[PDB]
Each structure stands twice: as structure tokens, then as C-alpha cells.
Design a protein around this nucleic acid. Structure first.
Ligand SMILES: [Mg+2]
Ligand SMILES: [Mg+2]
Lengths: 189, 61, 132
RNA sequence: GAGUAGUGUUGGGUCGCGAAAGGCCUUGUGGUACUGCCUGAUAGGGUGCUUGCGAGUGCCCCGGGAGGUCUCGUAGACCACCAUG
RNA sequence: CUCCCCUGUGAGGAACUACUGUCUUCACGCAGAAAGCGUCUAGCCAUGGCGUUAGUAUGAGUGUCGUGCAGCCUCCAGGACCCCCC
RNA sequence: AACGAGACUCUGGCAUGCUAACUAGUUACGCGACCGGUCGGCGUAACUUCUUAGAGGGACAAGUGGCGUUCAGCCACCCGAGAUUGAGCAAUAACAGGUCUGUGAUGCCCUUAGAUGUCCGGGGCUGCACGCGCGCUACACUGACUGGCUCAGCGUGUCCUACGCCGGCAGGCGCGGGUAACCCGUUGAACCCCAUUCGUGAUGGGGAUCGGGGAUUGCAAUUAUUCCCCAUGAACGAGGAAUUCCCAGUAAGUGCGGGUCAUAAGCUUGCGUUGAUUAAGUCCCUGCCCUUUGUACACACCGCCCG
């Protein structure tokens, strides 16, 4: 059997939306043991649609300068974050990644129109892959800004921001920036 | 109301800087209604878009 | 973007045109055919030219190719073209004709033809397109 | 009966449209299509709906019968600076 | 023009203490808004950023008191249904 | 038809088929050790999978299926080491680009014995109220420290340096190998990995500026050449208007070699290692290209020309 980080179970999780069912990974096959597969998903267009979602959260956690090249910092941090999550909510920690992706992603977003220096935005709507990507961005950035100096472990602070991104609370930096995007979308229309 | 949508065809890319994709929308409610729509980020045919404002139509940027 | 040089296509054109009988629809077949038939330097040239000899054959068996003339495909297109239905399409027991055509035949003393049928003239006159 | 009665009009005409009462003198046609609405005929003249558009398809009246988000395509994109070398 | 499957909070019960999960009240730290008022920037101009309103108005959660909210039974309703209209 | 583009050369990826190796190893068998194995420990036969490097194969949009005047070619999939390897060379033309300072490559000018010559001894290019520029290092919790565990490649060398012994540390002494796949060197490089100490404050983050000492190089170090021990421990709280470089073993982190070099890399030139976010699109901006078009310009708009 295939068990994530040795203690989890991937095949029992669920997806409630049709748009994010075709993109978000780790359901049927793609489920692996460890996040780092060192594969090439940027090789061709939408070939990064199929890589494991946990690896996807993993790749984006190196995103600031000193942490850049070090990938393992993440498969460390993503390790303790899941094991924290299961203690709080008490559900499959890979259900919490699904719900945070689904809720944190924008829906409608604004595209800047005008001349440089004058921002006048018009509302368009997000593509599924773009939804996933922006969502995960928001998750990692929310975790960083929240964890800079509170002296929180990023394990603790990402479990925080993830569970909060899943529940729908305004605690998550993620849900915040989403809510701003949708609201500007409302402003314009 | 929240709605769902299907991608029938990809037409061109609207944008100043070439940002938006201009795509064609079927409704997943089995209705035959056909509306053009602006979408951001990568789109390939067959995908489903969630519309918060479902009666809106596409304009050229 | 992968696109063949003048060298590639010109060479495969003349190679096919001379040697058409020796080539076959397999790649490495004609690859080794061209290592012999012509004299080419390097590799990436050879391989490409052969690829085009092949591609051009897959287009040849479809029908006439714009670039090449072979007596073998002239002969196969002499078979293909030559056809005829059991009876002619020019044979009808009743052929329909306008009164005036009948007049013109009557000048040539053919007003006695059996197969004819005189059909009613069309009453409105509009043969013209409404300008605007 | 009678294309009379009545009714109708741009110029006229040998007119257009078109009844009934009542009788008489013994059957007193078939085949085959369609048909949105308006005007003035199944003609002529306007004008439409079906999916935004383009095709198809259907749209006189009745009875009964069941089967239902009609099918195929699809760009439909539109909101003044500044001399001379 | 209905009837009867599931959703609600309108009334009666068990339960309510033991069961579990949510709203009350107090200590706790964390994110954290705007009407506006000013400023800066788009040649001129806020429909934007940034200051001050204020770390206010707030909301998500942990531990205290509730004799709560409930979950189990009925209807009163509301919606899927049908019909019907096409 | 010809040059330019491509082709080509140089580099990386494929080969359990071939040609072979005591100056590279492997398998096998012995001896050696400590509890059948573990060992860069010591030697003999066995061969090329490893390690090299030659020969030649291999990829041609090839195979299948879609979009295409079914035409080029464009997309998806399979079969596969590879369906995008990175650099060099670069036409007809030109710039009144940089080059008397790289040339025993020069046309002129000046200098020519108190020389604009040259050598000798010192100073100066390094100076400090200020602007503008590459680049280093940081602003800490994905972090600093302290111990522990295992990793590279390109090159350099008559100077690289093995092992001892004295030295807290830099360093001395010595005894050795190599003109190098032989010796440095199983090149035990940095992150990273595992434990430990630190706890949001100018803090152990940051280390400038200094005051003393030891050691090297050199004739010669004061104007600190560098290196090393203690102290001194300042700016710095993710950087305003603007803007730079970049699409896959890539950005980025991190050390390492070559150049300069007696002693020297905050520079350059290479080299591996850990390794992504996002796009496979558009002329908005910037930049040049064509096409149409107007011209009284052709020394070609720095043009022409009117009072
Ligand atoms: Mg432009
Ligand atoms: Mg002239």
C-alpha cells in the first residue's frame, strides 16, 4: 500500500468541485511516499498539472532568498505540519490541503487596464490551474508573513494558516487576499 | 447565483500586455446558451469555469 | 521550429524522382538506401533527407505530388484515372429541352429526334442580380 | 335560382366580390399535397417567433396517445509639448 | 390546481444532570475594516497606493459559569416534486 | 541558382554490443583483522558492467491519432537514452565607434646631453565636506552557535605538498612523492542531513571603527600588504521615485579551480552541488525591421529654405 510519510492514507480523501477535480493531484495514482520526486513538470505546457499536490505545496515553501536552494527544509516542515494538523482537527491532513486549496483560490480577479500610473481594473474570471497556483501561493506567503517573528515554528504557523484557510475564517492571510480580489471584482464588473 | 461553465473553444488572447484568454462558454446545466468570456491564467479546452456573475458578457480590452 | 532546408527537400525530390522503385515506406530502409544512392556528408543531413524521401512517398501513394514526375506513378495514375460506368451518363431515354433549342435543331433537320422532351419555358424574366 | 339579389372603386368598361328564399329531377367527382400572424383567396403585399447569431425543424381546428431541458454548427469581439545646426 | 419526499425554529414531550459537539460570562494572546479626513502619484484627474481616524468597530478560538443550544418523537411551515404550462 | 540562416566544429545525454588498459578499476581466490559479514588492508589469476576513449551506431516530426487550400507545417499520445544540449564561426555594407598606451606595426609634430632618454632614492596613482556607478554582507526562528554523520568537478604543480615531532592559533622544523588517470588525492569543499545551546531586545542577528600583541612575505610593510588571539563592538528593523537580469539541471543558495600572484580575491574566468515559483503568450511600453505613402532633401532633416 501507498502511505504518505509512512502514516497517512491518500485514497480516502475527497474533492467537492468539478473545476478543481481535474487538476489537484494525489487521489488515484499520483500518491507517493515522499514529496521530492525531482521530476520535470515545467517541461511542457500543463505537464505540471499532474504533479502531486503535496509536492506542489512543498515547492513553494522555498520562495524566499536564503531558503531558496534548500528543498529539504520544506519536506522537513511539511512533515511536522501535517502531523500537527491531525492533532487539531482530527481529520486526514490531506483533506485539509484540499479544502484550503479550494477555499483560498480566487474566483474572479481583476486585470489592469489603462496607461501606466493609472490603475483601472476590469473583472475577469480565474482559470482552474491559475486557481490552484494562486491559492498555494497565498498559502505559503500567509505562512511566511505570519511566521516571520512571532517565534512560531513554520510547522505550527502553516498548520494554523492551513486549517484556518480550510474553515473559511479571516485568520488566514490567504482568505484575506482572496476576499480583496473578489471584492475589487465586485467594484468593477 | 453561482454557476458552472464549459470551454467549447479557445479563440484569441485579449490584453494590453497579452494577459487574458478569450474563451467560449457552454453552460453545464445542459442548456445550449453560448457566451464568450474573459479568463486569466492558462486554459485548455474542456475545462470548467465557476462564474459568480453568470449573466455578464465579454468585452475587448 | 523544425522545418526542412532547401537542401533537404530539393535533395529528397531528386533522389525520389530518379530512384522511386528502390525506396520504401520504412524510414531506416530508405536511410540505408540513401547512404548508397547519393553521397552525403555527416549524419543529421542524411537522416533528414531520408525522412523527407519517406514523407514524400506517404504523400505519393495518396496521389500526384507537385514536385516529382515518375513514369511509375504516371502509369498507376493511368490505371486509377481510367474508369467507366457500365452505361454512359450521356444516355437518357428522355432528355429535356427548351422550345428554342428545338428550333435550332429544326434548322439542322433534327426536329425528328425521338428522345427529346419539350419542357415549358419559364415565364418570369429575372436572370439578373439586384444591384446595390 | 343567377355570377342575378345585395355588396364593393383610380380612369372608365361588356365590371370585381358574391347571397338566400324556394323549388325541381333522381346520387348529387376521384386522386394528392400544405396550414405562424396581419392585410385581400392555399394567390399578391407586410411581418415574425425556435439559441445570442447562421442553418435546420415546427408553428389552422379537434380528440386521444405518449416523449421532453429540439438538433447541428459559431467571434457574436466596437466605449496638443519641442526653435536652431 | 394540488400532494408528500426532504430541508426549518413556529408550538408540545422525553432527554435535559451522565452523553458529546455550538452560542452565553471573565482572563488570554493573534490576525484586523471602513464612511471620512489629509497626502503622494498617473502631463492635468482617484476610480489607486500611503498616512490619520485605531491597533477603534470587529471575528476565529482555549479555559471558566450556563441549568442554555441541541441531537431522539409529532405536527405547523418551507423548499424538491409533480401536475400545469409549453 | 550563390553568400548570409541552417548545415558545420567544439561540449553535455545514450551503448551490460565492439576495441582494450599494472598509470583505472572490477569479479574470483588466497592471507590479515574484529566480532557468516565488515574493512581503501596486502597480494594475484578474471574481465570491461563501473573508470577512461576510440571506432561506429542512434532522431529523421519518426510511429499513431487530431488541426490544416489535408500543403507546409502546428498539437496530443506512444515507441525510446534523447521529440527544446550549451557555445564558436558569422553576408553585401557601412560608423569620420574604441586602439600612437599591446606591437623592432607607422604617416606627421616635438623632444633630443642642466633630454619628454634611461637608470638610482624617496614620495604620488590609495589622498576627503560631496554627487553617480558595478559588487560584496546583512538585517535572524526556512535563523546564529556548538558537537556529530557522510557528498563534488574543473583544473593547477620543480612548485603542489604525504607523514611525523614542536607549536593554544597563525606557524616552524624537518624527513618523503610527483614533469603527473602514477605523487598532493578514494582529491573526506560548503550548504544539506542528526542531536545541542539560544529565546523577539541592537539579543549570541550585524559586524564596521579601533588599542594592544604573536607569525609570515619580502631589499624594503609606517600610509594598518596579508594572516592570527583577545578585547572595541557602530550603521542596519526587508529598503522612496525609478530600474536591472532571467523559462528548466534554468533562476537561486552554496563552496571549489584557473587568471592577476614573492605574499593576495570583496574582482574575473571556469566547476560542481541543493534546486524552484511562473509563462509556452502579446506589441502596451521600449528597441529596431519590413510594406504602403508624401517629399522643393541626395554632403540625404545636423537637409533645405522665406522675409
Ligand atoms: Mg510597439
Ligand atoms: Mg538635389
Amino acid at each position: 500500500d501507498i502511505k504518505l510519510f509512512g502514516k497517512w492514507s491518500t485514497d480516502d480523501v475527497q474533492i467537492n468541485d468539478i473545476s478543481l477535480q481535474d487538476y489537484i493531484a494525489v487521489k488515484e495514482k499520483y500518491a507517493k511516499y515522499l514529496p521530492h520526486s525531482a521530476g520535470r513538470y515545467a517541461a511542457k505546457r500543463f505537464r505540471k498539472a499532474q504533479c502531486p499536490i503535496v509536492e506542489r505545496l512543498t515547492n513553494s515553501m522555498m520562495m524566499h532568498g536564503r531558503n531558496n536552494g534548500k528543498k529539504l527544509m520544506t519536506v522537513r516542515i511539511v512533515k511536522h505540519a501535517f502531523e500537527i494538523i491531525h492533532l487539531l482537527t482530527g481529520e486526514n491532513p490531506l483533506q485539509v490541503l484540499v479544502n484550503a486549496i479550494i477555499n483560498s483560490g480566487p474566483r474572479e480577479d481583476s486585470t489592469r487596464i489603462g496607461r501606466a500610473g493609472t490603475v483601472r481594473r476590469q473583472a475577469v474570471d480565474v482559470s482552474p490551474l491559475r486557481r490552484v497556483n494562486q491559492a498555494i501561493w497565498l498559502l505559503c506567503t500567509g505562512a511566511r508573513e505570519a511566521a516571520f517573528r512571532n517565534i512560531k515554528t513554520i510547522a505550527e504557523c502553516l498548520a494554523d494558516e492551513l486549517i484556518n484557510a480550510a474553515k473559511g475564517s479571516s485568520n488566514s492571510y490567504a482568505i484575506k487576499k482572496k476576499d480583496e480580489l473578489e471584492r475589487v471584482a465586485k467594484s468593477n464588473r | 447565483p453561482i454557476k458552472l461553465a464549459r470551454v467549447t473553444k479557445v479563440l484569441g488572447r485579449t490584453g494590453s500586455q497579452g494577459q487574458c484568454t478569450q474563451v467560449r462558454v457552454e453552460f453545464m446545466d445542459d442548456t445550449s446558451r453560448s457566451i464568450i468570456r474573459n479568463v486569466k491564467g492558462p486554459v485548455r479546452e474542456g475545462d470548467v469555469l465557476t462564474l459568480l456573475e453568470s449573466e455578464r458578457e465579454a468585452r475587448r480590452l | 521550429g523544425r522545418v526542412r532546408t532547401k537542401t533537404v527537400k530539393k535533395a529528397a525530390r531528386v533522389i525520389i524522382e530518379k530512384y522511386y522503385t528502390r525506396l520504401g515506406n520504412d524510414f531506416h530502409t530508405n536511410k540505408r538506401v540513401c547512404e548508397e544512392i547519393a553521397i552525403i556528408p555527416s549524419k543529421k543531413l542524411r537522416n533528414k533527407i531520408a525522412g523527407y524521401v519517406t514523407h514524400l512517398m506517404k504523400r505519393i501513394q495518396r496521389g500526384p505530388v507537385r514536385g516529382i514526375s515518375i513514369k511509375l506513378q504516371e502509369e498507376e495514375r493511368e490505371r486509377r484515372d481510367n474508369y467507366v460506368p457500365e452505361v454512359s451518363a450521356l444516355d437518357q431515354e428522355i432528355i429535356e429541352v427548351d422550345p428554342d433549342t428545338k428550333e435550332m435543331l429544326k434548322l439542322l433537320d433534327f426536329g425528328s429526334l425521338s428522345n427529346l422532351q419539350v419542357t415549358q419555358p419559364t415565364v418570369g424574366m429575372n436572370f439578373k442580380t439586384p444591384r446595390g
